[PDB]
Amino acid sequence: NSNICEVCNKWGRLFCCDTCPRSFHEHCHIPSVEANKNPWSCIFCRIKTIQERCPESQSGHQESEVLMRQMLPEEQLKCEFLLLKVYCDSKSCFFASEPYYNREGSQGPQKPMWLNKVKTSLNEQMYTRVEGFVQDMRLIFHNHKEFYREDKFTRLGIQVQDIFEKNFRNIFAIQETS
Ligand SMILES: [Zn+2]
Ligand SMILES: [Zn+2]
Ligand SMILES: [Zn+2]
């Protein structure tokens, strides 16, 4: 196994995958690394199994159909993995915890949102369709762009949204376009 957390790239108390060489902090993995289960397989491994069981699942899909899917176990997992792919980027730190808004010339968003809130909502099974999860994730970046206006810090929202969108298209096999 690797000697660093796959998500945050630090050492520490790490749980090792049985079917691949990745390792995780307990609360860096999503879902949080399970109490027992020997062997244990990481989310990366579980996602790869879905693809291997149903190779046609990699054929192109329309985003509108994906969003309307109900959050059955495989879609739950896919959203957990997409969330984890965002935490994998170090720039996710800016969006992880609850924000506050006090900048001259700007007003805070009407509906604040942040990654740990989306993480709790997934854990609590609060999303009934893929659309709910995707709307909250895009809302994080949209709130940031609106609030920061012409400050160059706006760019952090563009950067982390690009990580989200590339991973969304990969994980849910969105049909490639020009
Ligand atoms: Zn970690
Ligand atoms: Zn694994
Ligand atoms: Zn199949």
Side-chain angles (χ1 to χ4, degrees), residues 30 67-73 75-80 83 87 111-140 164:
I30 313 179
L67 298 182
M68 294 306 312
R69 295 176 189 167
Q70 295 179 17
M71 292 280 263
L72 296 182
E75 307 313 308
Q76 173 83 29
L77 194 70
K78 289 175 169 208
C79 295
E80 289 167 345
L83 182 57
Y87 280 102
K111 187 179 165 180
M113 193 49 58
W114 59 101
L115 297 170
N116 292 351
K117 184 175 175 75
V118 177
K119 180 179 279 201
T120 291
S121 299
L122 273 172
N123 175 238
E124 294 181 4
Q125 298 161 303
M126 300 290 302
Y127 297 118
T128 58
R129 293 171 191 271
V130 174
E131 181 173 43
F133 165 84
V134 171
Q135 285 171 342
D136 274 355
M137 291 292 286
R138 291 173 167 165
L139 183 64
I140 297 171
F164 174 74

Side-chain angles (χ1 to χ4, degrees), residues 5 7-8 25 28:
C5 181
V7 186
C8 73
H25 302 102
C28 284

Side-chain angles (χ1 to χ4, degrees), residues 22-36 38-173:
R22 302 176 174 93
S23 310
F24 305 83
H25 302 102
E26 177 166 9
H27 296 319
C28 284
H29 198 266
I30 313 179
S32 290
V33 169
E34 296 73 15
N36 208 288
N38 319 52
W40 177 78
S41 272
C42 77
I43 189 150
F44 293 78
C45 283
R46 299 171 62 192
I47 290 282
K48 184 204 305 311
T49 294
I50 302 318
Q51 290 173 5
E52 288 175 349
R53 287 179 165 157
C54 282
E56 68 273 37
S57 71
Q58 293 162 290
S59 294
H61 296 78
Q62 299 295 111
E63 181 174 314
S64 65
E65 177 273 317
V66 164
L67 298 182
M68 294 306 312
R69 295 176 189 167
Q70 295 179 17
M71 292 280 263
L72 296 182
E74 289 193 354
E75 307 313 308
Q76 173 83 29
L77 194 70
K78 289 175 169 208
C79 295
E80 289 167 345
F81 185 46
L82 178 48
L83 182 57
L84 177 137
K85 285 290 194 162
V86 175
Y87 280 102
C88 290
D89 196 282
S90 63
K91 293 161 176 285
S92 68
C93 67
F94 295 110
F95 299 106
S97 73
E98 191 175 359
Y100 61 86
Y101 301 98
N102 194 3
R103 181 198 192 240
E104 180 185 341
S106 288
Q107 273 287 333
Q110 305 289 324
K111 187 179 165 180
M113 193 49 58
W114 59 101
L115 297 170
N116 292 351
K117 184 175 175 75
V118 177
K119 180 179 279 201
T120 291
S121 299
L122 273 172
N123 175 238
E124 294 181 4
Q125 298 161 303
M126 300 290 302
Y127 297 118
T128 58
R129 293 171 191 271
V130 174
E131 181 173 43
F133 165 84
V134 171
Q135 285 171 342
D136 274 355
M137 291 292 286
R138 291 173 167 165
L139 183 64
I140 297 171
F141 313 116
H142 193 262
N143 282 353
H144 176 98
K145 288 168 72 169
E146 296 296 303
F147 180 69
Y148 290 107
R149 300 287 201 107
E150 309 300 287
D151 195 297
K152 65 194 174 169
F153 190 61
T154 56
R155 174 158 180 267
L156 268 296
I158 297 170
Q159 294 175 320
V160 182
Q161 181 149 26
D162 194 41
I163 298 296
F164 174 74
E165 298 296 343
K166 282 181 186 283
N167 281 281
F168 173 71
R169 293 189 303 266
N170 179 261
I171 290 164
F172 287 95

